[PDB]
Amino acid sequence: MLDNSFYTAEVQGPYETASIGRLELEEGGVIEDCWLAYATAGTLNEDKSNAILIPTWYSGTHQTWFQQYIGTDHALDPSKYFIISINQIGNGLSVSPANTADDSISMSKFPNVRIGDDVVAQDRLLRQEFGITELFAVVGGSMGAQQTYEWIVRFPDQVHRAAPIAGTAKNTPHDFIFTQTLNETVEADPGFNGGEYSSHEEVADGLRRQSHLWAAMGFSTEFWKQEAWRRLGLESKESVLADFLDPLFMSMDPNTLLNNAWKWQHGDVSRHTGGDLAAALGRVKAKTFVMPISEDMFFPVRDCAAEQALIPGSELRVIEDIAGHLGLFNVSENYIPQIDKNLKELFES
Amino acid sequence: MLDNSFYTAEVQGPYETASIGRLELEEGGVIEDCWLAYATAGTLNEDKSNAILIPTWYSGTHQTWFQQYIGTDHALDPSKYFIISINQIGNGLSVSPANTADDSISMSKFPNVRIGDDVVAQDRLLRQEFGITELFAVVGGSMGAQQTYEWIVRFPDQVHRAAPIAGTAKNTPHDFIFTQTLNETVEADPGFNGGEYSSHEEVADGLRRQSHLWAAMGFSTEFWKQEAWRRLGLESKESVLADFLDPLFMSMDPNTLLNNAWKWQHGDVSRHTGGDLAAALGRVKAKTFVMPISEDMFFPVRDCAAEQALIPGSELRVIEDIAGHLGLFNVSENYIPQIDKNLKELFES
Ligand SMILES: [Cl-]
Ligand SMILES: [Cl-]
Ligand SMILES: [Cl-]
Ligand SMILES: [Cl-]
Ligand SMILES: [Mg+2]
Ligand SMILES: [Mg+2]
């Protein structure tokens, strides 16, 4: 076990943990004690029919959702819904390479986990802890959208509404390559020590490089050209890196990123239907709003629109944001208003 | 001095070298013996009025131009024009960090060179070796386009026609950041040794990582999604890296790449007019066809269209290509026909 203050309640906000027991992974690995970190708001009604699940994204947790997306002034309204965010396996809050007490899967021995494993694990947690057998909606961004897609394909009758924001049901070759460069730059740091480092601070250079890779692909050319980063209260593009992006990624655990990156790379709901993507998305019964971000460079509108065309009864709702993919962080004035408007209309479906 | 077979006439095709003497650089540095590598096709006529200059791009030489762009079936017709490509200072063929006999500027001591320094050096070479004082056309791609823009702003009366392909006159913040990630991944290789390596093979990992960065930003999402690389005779996306892109970049000299990358980052014709880009491009007298590639991710059409609007008498001629920026390599079936049509129309003006 490693000590990283970033993966604590003080930084991420309060959360709970619960073990679902033994989890056999699709790739063949086993997590004997699979425990998950989750945070909730609101109250489950009598029929337990008002639950909303929020999967977390790469390098993220439940934090951004409770801070930016959730509130009585938002669509994700805790006065109406039992809202629960369940942290990804390996994401640093749930059972992960650097926090597991199981030596057989500690650090560099931690097994490959697929999107499918998270969804199975989440289903078990919801049933075990809350007796939730159906979800009012599943809402997630990026990797959270991947998990959202996996939910409505794997358990079609258990989800009534779906909001995959800025993500795809089947990972594309370009996205795969992009994520590979993220992995390569962390592994390139000699402090990484093959994933058996004594502290994340030893991989600071690798993590800083990944941040700069996110600066290049995570926003847009116009974001930088128009200096939209000024609404962060910063005075130079170099400051955006040095005082915001870099400290964020340098706070994270390398093995957590590498694990979740592998999961991200291999996201594919067509595994359920022999590689037939149309057949997989054809299984969807949840009312689905596909919501890409306009300037997203690696989850572009055309990729999400192509998948939306395969989902029966679905709608395409483009989120306009100059900040591209990292608009998920809510760095633009009209981001949350667009999210709230679309989610409200979805929740009325 | 280092021996690298990649930087020879055998690999790049026949060329010559000539010294233009002492060159004082804009950044304050000095190249006492500034010699340039150049390649020609065709014959300069009596009044020296049929000369076309082709600046070279990052990591490239005259090779791709003579192989893909030049011929009697092309607009760049050697039976009509004296076509001369002059290699960038520091590009491995011209005087460079790894080939200079001047120890004071060898390897990590090699000074910062700007686009403006190249254009001054080229003007001198043309005047000195051929008595050329005016150019029928200047044609260049990417960094070659930057040099093209610098030519028509710095020496407005010396260029009759200009064809900046896939490049801008003043570099944008996003492009700067992208190029920074290229430099960082080379510098991250411990074999680089602060630019004092004994062989480029010692920086193989760094060069390979940069190749993968080019895979992510140098094409487009659709290029990979449609597997457009299959018409290159490659059978997997992994092969595109391992069998085409990686061996190419692993053949190159790190100090050459870093030098030309710095040059690329700081390209700015507005230096001539106190930072006023509109005033700089307002000087242009050459008939100019601004030709961005439709899917170019870091020299996007909107960036080039914005600049074309400031150049009097110019036209915007978008090149449609799924391959994005690296469409410059001529990897698409309809690339050269678009280039030829536009250039012929330019040359007929
Ligand atoms: Cl993500
Ligand atoms: Cl978060
Ligand atoms: Cl270039
Ligand atoms: Cl070349
Ligand atoms: Mg709020
Ligand atoms: Mg030809």
UniProtKB/Swiss-Prot annotation, chains A, B:
Residues 60-329 form the AB hydrolase-1 domain. GO terms for biological process: biosynthetic process. GO terms for molecular function: homoserine O-acetyltransferase activity; hydrolase activity. SUPFAM superfamilies: alpha/beta-Hydrolases (SSF53474). Keywords: Hydrolase. The active site is at 142 (nucleophile), 296, 325. Transmembrane segments: none annotated. It holds the Pfam family Abhydrolase_1. It is an enzyme of class 3 (hydrolase). It comes from the Bacteria. Its EC number is 3.1.1.-. The 3D structure excludes the ability of the enzyme to bind homoserine and acetyl-CoA, indicating that it cannot function as a homoserine acetyltransferase. Esterase that catalyzes the hydrolysis of 4-nitrophenyl acetate in vitro. Homodimer. Belongs to the AB hydrolase superfamily. Acetyl esterase family. This is Probable esterase Cgl0839. It comes from Corynebacterium glutamicum (strain ATCC 13032 / DSM 20300 / JCM 1318 / BCRC 11384 / CCUG 27702 / LMG 3730 / NBRC 12168 / NCIMB 10025 / NRRL B-2784 / 534). The lineage of its organism: Bacteria, Bacillati, Actinomycetota, Actinomycetes, Mycobacteriales.
